[PDB]
Amino acid sequence: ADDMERIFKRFDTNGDGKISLSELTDALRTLGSTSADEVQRMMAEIDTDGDGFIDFNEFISFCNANPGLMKDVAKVF
Ligand SMILES: [Ca+2]
Ligand SMILES: [Ca+2]
């Protein structure tokens, strides 16, 4: 089972296969109500290649380290 898949469809509001400051924010703003000011900082560490976008691979690379989040995000997202 790939829970990150179904959830990946949310974070990827652009439906292009990556998460930017416009898409990511949509998540942290829906579950946290934050802004891009923190997004660029959150993805900056998640980005395994750092290209201004968060792919699917890196998405799990970092998310995996956050077992307490994947449980909350997979509850609504
Ligand atoms: Ca996208
Ligand atoms: Ca990337």
Swiss-Prot record:
Gene assigned in the entry: P7
Protein function: May be involved in the regulation of pollen-tube growth.
Binding residues for Ca(2+) 2: 47, 49, 51, 58
Tissues in which the UniProt entry reports expression: Specifically expressed in pollen.
Record-given protein name: Polcalcin Phl p 7
Listed Pfam families: EF-hand_7
Quaternary structure annotation from Swiss-Prot or TrEMBL: Monomer.
Positions with a binding annotation for Ca(2+) 1: 12, 14, 16, 18, 23
Organism: Phleum pratense (Common timothy)
Tagged with keyword Repressor: no
Coiled coil: none
Origin: domain of life: Eukaryota
